[PDB]
C-alpha cells in the first residue's frame, strides 16, 4: 500500500535529520556578513548547521522574511530554511530581482514536485502509479511538466474536465496546507532504498550521484511525499497564488508503461495575474511542451 511507503519514507527522512543533528556537536559560531543590496555589511554571528537564512530575516525585519524567497550565500542560491554551514556572504533573493532566472528555476522545480505529489495520491491504491522524472522545460515554454508512468489498467483512461479539476483541487489543497519544503542531502545508497520500488526514481538518483564526486543526492519532502530535486526549491507551498492543471499529454512509446506528461501553470503571490491574462496563459499552457 502507498501509505506504508510514505510511513517508511517519512521515518528514514526523520532518522537522517537526527543523524545530521547528532553529527554536529555543540553550536559553532559563524560570522555571516550581509552582502545584500539593502542594509549591506551587517555581520551576524550564527550557529553552524543550525541557523537558516530565515532566522537572519527574522533578525532584521518581517519585510525581509515576506519578500525573501531565496538566499545567495557566497553567490550561491540557498533555500531560506537551509541551515547555514560556514561564515559567508548572504544576500536575499526576491521574485522582483533584476535577474530571477535562478529564482525561476527553483519555483519551476518546486511546482513540478508539487504536481508529482498530487498524481501519486490522486489515483486509488488499487492502480499502480510510478513517477518517472520531472522534465526540465524553460519558463518561456508556458507550462511546467511532470512525467508519470501509469499501470496497464489505466491505459484506456484519459482525464476528463472534472478529473483535471480534481487534480487542481488537490494542488490547491496543498497550497492551502502551506507545507514547508524540507531539504535533505542524502547518499545514493539510502536514497535508492527509499525509492527502491520505483525503478525510474532509482536511475535519477544514480544520475545525480554520478554527476557529483560523492553519492550525495538532493531530496525534498513535502509532508509525507518525498522527491529528488535538480536544484533548490521554494521554501513553502503557500508561495503559489494561482495553480492550474492545464492538460495531460500521453507519450507515444507507452508499450511497457503509459508515460504521461502533465502540463500545469502556477503563479506566486508576489506575481498575480489578471483574469484574462491567466485564461490566455492557461490556454497557452495546454500545448505539448518538448524538451530542447
Amino acid at each position: 500500500s502507498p501509505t506504508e511507503l510514505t510511513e517508511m519514507r517519512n521515518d528514514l527522512f526523520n532518522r537522517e535529520k537526527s543523524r545530521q543533528l547528532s553529527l554536529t556537536p555543540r553550536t559553532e559560531k559563524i560570522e555571516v556578513k550581509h552582502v545584500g543590496k539593502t542594509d549591506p555589511g551587517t555581520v551576524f554571528v550564527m550557529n553552524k548547521n543550525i541557523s537558516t537564512p530565515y532566522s537572519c530575516a527574522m533578525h532584521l525585519s518581517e519585510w525581509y522574511c515576506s519578500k525573501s524567497i531565496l538566499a545567495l550565500v557566497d553567490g550561491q542560491p540557498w533555500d531560506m530554511y537551509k541551515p547555514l554551514t560556514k561564515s559567508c556572504e548572504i544576500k536575499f533573493l526576491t521574485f522582483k530581482d533584476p535577474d530571477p532566472k535562478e529564482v525561476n528555476k527553483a519555483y519551476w522545480r518546486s511546482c513540478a514536485m508539487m504536481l508529482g505529489c498530487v498524481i501519486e495520491r490522486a489515483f486509488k491504491d488499487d492502480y499502480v502509479v510510478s513517477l518517472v522524472r520531472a522534465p526540465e522545460v524553460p519558463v518561456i515554454a508556458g507550462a511546467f511538466c511532470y512525467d508519470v508512468t501509469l499501470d496497464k489498467r489505466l491505459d484506456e483512461w484519459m482525464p476528463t474536465k472534472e478529473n483535471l479539476r480534481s487534480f487542481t483541487k488537490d494542488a490547491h489543497a496543498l497550497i492551502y496546507r502551506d507545507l514547508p519544503f524540507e531539504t535533505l542531502d542524502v547518499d545514493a545508497r539510502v536514497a535508492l532504498e527509499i525509492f527502491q520500488h520505483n525503478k525510474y526514481k532509482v536511475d535519477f538518483i544514480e544520475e545525480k550521484a554520478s554527476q557529483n564526486p560523492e553519492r550525495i543526492v538532493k531530496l525534498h519532502r513535502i509532508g509525507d511525499f518525498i522527491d529528488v530535486s535538480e536544484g533548490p526549491l521554494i521554501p513553502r507551498t503557500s508561495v503559489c497564488f494561482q495553480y492550474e492543471v492545464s492538460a495531460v499529454h500521453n507519450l507515444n512509446p507507452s508499450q511497457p508503461n503509459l508515460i504521461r506528461r502533465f502540463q500545469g501553470l502556477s503563479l506566486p503571490t508576489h506575481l498575480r495575474a489578471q483574469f484574462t491574462i491567466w485564461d490566455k496563459l492557461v490556454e497557452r499552457s495546454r500545448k505539448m511542451v518538448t524538451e530542447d
Binding site: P98, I140, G142, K280
Partner: protein, 144 residues
C-alpha cells in the same frame, strides 16, 4: 476647468506669474500638488510661445507680463525654445512628493522642465522583462 485659487482672478494669475517666473529661473520647483498641476498647462503653452519664434511680437507681451524678471525673456527664446524644438510636448515633468510635515499636511509635488541640467529626479521604473511573469508573457508573445 479651473481651480478656485487666489483672493481673486488676478491673484491666481499673479500667483501663477510668480510660480512661472520661479520655475523658469530654476527649472525645478517644489510646491503644493494642486498648484503644480494647475500651472503645468501654462508652462507647456509658454514653451509653444517660445517655439512660435522670438520675432513674434505677441509672444513678447505674454512673456513680458508672465515673467517679472526680464533676463528670463532672452532665456525663454534662446534657451527654452531651442531646447524643446525637437519635443512636441510634455516639456514639464510633475511628480508627487510626500506631504509637508508642517502641521497642515499639504499635498506636495515637484515640477521641472525636461532637458534641464539639474540631476535627474528619482523616477519610477516599470518591472523588468526578466521577471517570471514577464518571461511567461514573452513566451506567449513569441508563439503568437
Amino acid at each position: 476647468v479651473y481651480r478656485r485659487l487666489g483672493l481673486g482672478p488676478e491673484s491666481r494669475i499673479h500667483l501663477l506669474r510668480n510660480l512661472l517666473t520661479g520655475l523658469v529661473r530654476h527649472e525645478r520647483i517644489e510646491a503644493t500638488w494642486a498648484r503644480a498641476d494647475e500651472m503645468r498647462g501654462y508652462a507647456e503653452k509658454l514653451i509653444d510661445y517660445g517655439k512660435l519664434g522670438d520675432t513674434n511680437e505677441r509672444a513678447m507681451r505674454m512673456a513680458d507680463f508672465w515673467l517679472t524678471e526680464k533676463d528670463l525673456i532672452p532665456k525663454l527664446f534662446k534657451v527654452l525654445a531651442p531646447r524643446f524644438q525637437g519635443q512636441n510636448g510634455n516639456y514639464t515633468r510633475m511628480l508627487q512628493i510626500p506631504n509637508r510635515k508642517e502641521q497642515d499636511r499639504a499635498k506636495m509635488a515637484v515640477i521641472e522642465y525636461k532637458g534641464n541640467y539639474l540631476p535627474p529626479l528619482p523616477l519610477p521604473h516599470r518591472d523588468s522583462n526578466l521577471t517570471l511573469l514577464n518571461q511567461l508573457l514573452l513566451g506567449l508573445q513569441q508563439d503568437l
